[PDB]
């Protein structure tokens, strides 16, 4: 369905985003 | 509901994001 | 509707962000 597809693409992009979050948090704490 | 649950994960990441913003603006205003 | 709220809240957070984005950019250029 287009919704299962939407669910898939959202979960994937979320998690990928959450990973830039962790990577950014890391760079941020190190800077300080 | 599978959306509710995802809505929950989002809220969680939303809260952590606001925190990153609070700490980040502070550290920033201090550098200037 | 919860779904409408989330979208609304999400959109509401953009101004501040873009603003920090722009302020950091400037400060970045100078230095």
């Amino acid at each position: 369905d287009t919704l299962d597809e939407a669910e898939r693409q959202w979960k994937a992009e979320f998690h990928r985003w959450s990973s830039y979050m962790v990577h950014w948090k890391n760079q941020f704490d190190h800077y300080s | 509901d599978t959306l509710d649950e995802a809505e929950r994960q989002w809220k969680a990441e939303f809260h952590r994001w606001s925190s990153y913003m609070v700490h980040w603006k502070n550290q920033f205003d201090h550098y200037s | 509707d919860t779904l409408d709220e989330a979208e609304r809240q999400w959109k509401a957070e953009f101004h501040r962000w873009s603003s920090y984005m722009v302020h950091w950019k400037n400060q970045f250029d100078h230095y």
Partner: peptide, 15 residues
């Protein structure tokens, strides 16, 4: 100079 602000906040799930 410190790291730029965290990435743009991710959009709410819709499906």
């Amino acid at each position: 100079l410190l790291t730029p602000p965290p990435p743009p906040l991710f959009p709410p799930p819709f499906f």
